[PDB]
Amino acid sequence: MKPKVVLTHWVHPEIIELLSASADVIPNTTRETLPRSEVIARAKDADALMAFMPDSIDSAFLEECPKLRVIGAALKGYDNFDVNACTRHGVWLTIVPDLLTIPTAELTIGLLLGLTRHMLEGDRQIRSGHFQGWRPTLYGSGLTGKTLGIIGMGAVGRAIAQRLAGFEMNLLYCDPIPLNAEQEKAWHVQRVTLDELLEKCDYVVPMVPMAAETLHLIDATALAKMKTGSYLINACRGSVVDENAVIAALASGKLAGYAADVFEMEEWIRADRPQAIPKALLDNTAQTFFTPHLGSAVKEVRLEIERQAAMNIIQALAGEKPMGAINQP
Amino acid sequence: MKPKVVLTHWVHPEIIELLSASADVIPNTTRETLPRSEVIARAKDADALMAFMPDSIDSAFLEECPKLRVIGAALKGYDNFDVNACTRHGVWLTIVPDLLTIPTAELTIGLLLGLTRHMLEGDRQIRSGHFQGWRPTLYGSGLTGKTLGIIGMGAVGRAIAQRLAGFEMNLLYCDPIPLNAEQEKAWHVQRVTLDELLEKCDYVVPMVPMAAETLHLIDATALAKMKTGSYLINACRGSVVDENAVIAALASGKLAGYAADVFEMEEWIRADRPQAIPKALLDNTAQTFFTPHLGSAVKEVRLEIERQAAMNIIQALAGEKPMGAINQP
Secondary structure (H helix, E strand, C coil): CCEEEEEECCCCCCHHHHHHHHCCCCCCCCCCCCCCHHHHHCCCCCCCEEECCCCCCCCHHHHHHCCEEEEEEECCCCCCCCCHHHHHCEEEEECCCCCCHHHHHHHHHHHHHCCCCCCHHHHHHHHHHCCCCCCCCCCCCCCCCCEEEEECCCCCHHHHHHHHHHHHCEEEEEECCCHHHHHHHHHHHEEEEEEHHHHCCCCEEEECCCHHHHHHCCCCHHHCCCCCCEEEEEECCHEEECCHHHHHHHHHEEEEEEEEEHHHHCCCCCCCCCCCCCCCHHHCCEEEECCCCCCCEEEEHHHHHHHHHHHHHHHHCCCCCCCCCCCCC | CCCEEEEEECCCCCHHHHCCCCEEECHHHCCCCCHHHHHHHCCCCCCEEECCCCCCHHHHHCCCCCCCCCCEEEECCCCCHHHHHHHHHEEEEEECCCCCCCHHHHHHHHHHHHHHHHHHHHHHHHCCCCCCCCCCCEECCCCCCCEEEEECCCHHHCCCCCCCHHHHCCEECCCCCCHHHHHHHHHHHHEHHHHHHHHHHHHHEEEHHHHHHCCECHHHHHHHHCCCCCEECCCCCHHHHCCHHHHHHHHHEEEEEEEECHHHHCCCCCCCCCCCHHHHHHHHCEEEEECCCCCCCCCHHHHHHHHHHHHHHHHHCCCCCCCCEECCC
């Protein structure tokens, strides 16, 4: 008699028990992404679905699941959902706002420090067993007195600026919408154009929203404008950086380093899409620092994201209007 | 011509050029520490020596260098030098000011972020070639809302608190001498006793000033007072942490992780000293993050340390009292 809820990815045990009171839960007991054909097979008979980044909810999917009443996305964005198809199928579509902002900002700063201070090579030198004390090796670039530019001053850009404000750097940003005077003073951040940003910075951090004019914002033309010996940190999205232009800039000496949490191969919304991370990047351990999309990979934050998606599902199944709904079926 | 200067370790080419105007320079072209016998072979007819952390200047060394007039240490301390033997042999011994504060504070925060966000294991997964997109793995621990305590509040601890002030944490500290009230308010850092710090902190950062080093400040008793699942970050000095006690606390689950830039095996002035970093720490890549004494490994600080040591040698060779002298020959 109970409705069934399918969760496409692993969630904390507490979240399953929370949903259990009002629904029969079909969980993913592994840490892997199930093939789409297996997700659809489990959801065919489901009244609710918790969706994650690798899910692509199109009309084809909805047509296979005629009982669906709510998709609770454990996500802030909904680029992978055909919203109006959900509406036409009578399916609530809900999202979770804002929770990824701060952990993404903290990770971006972690990537900056790990890359500029050669910390990965440093750890490999320790694990080798040959550490016998200080050596004149792995001299990096410090933060204080340097110029860092944030391209895009949305929620994550503001979180980064607030955190770097204590580091005695020269902080620049560009955005079509300026911060107010109170914010610029509190964080000591100076508005410039994008061309000025690229001209002046030792460190360039893109954090722009998704748009057509965002594709390869950092291309060969942009890298040519940047300071020789600068560093680029990308925890925004794979499509904002031309990874092949980065490879060329690392080889020529234009870039001293590239760090990334995100990769072009992730974009399943694109046709000119690579299938792996370029080998020239994977091989270049001296100049790169990578993480596998860990921007929100904080246990406490993931639990609260799953909790919000679960509450949205419970609310919708109870005939309420879900707190994170973006449509109205 | 004319006086000869031996540099025991590699220095930036501009330092070579600076010394060359008044001296014939015998550089270490490698990033390795020379064996003692080779240093003596170079210095036997040198007028000046630039010394670094791995050097050890005793009476026996000086007896083999009858022309030596000055040893310029590229170091803020002089533990490794028999100062009175220098004096007796007519040799100036000079040091440089402490310039390590800010890059050590920056590295400590990099260690904290790298450790808590599983960034090394993340990089290993990217380089494995098997990344296929976001997955519910490598969930770490966040900063915002958590409690971090700095044990000791000297120059480096103040630098850390200033930088963490923007991270929306609960910052605690303990020190026999309080910060002034404007700093406690500006950084939102609260003074507690050591026992209260250990009890309340998710993150513990020993950073005692030079005047207050305690052997094994963090030992089995301290770790038993800490929160289960806490993290410990040591960029202060090898001797302040009982590494065998840390190994046991990682094994029991008391500590979720340990990161360090310094190691007990470095203490060449203590007698109960080990020769290698313990194997159980080196093997534990899941729960540790290590760097090979990189606290001040930033080009700008290394360059300034070398410059001041060279200027001291230049002054002493010209018959002046060098600015960084610690003795009177």
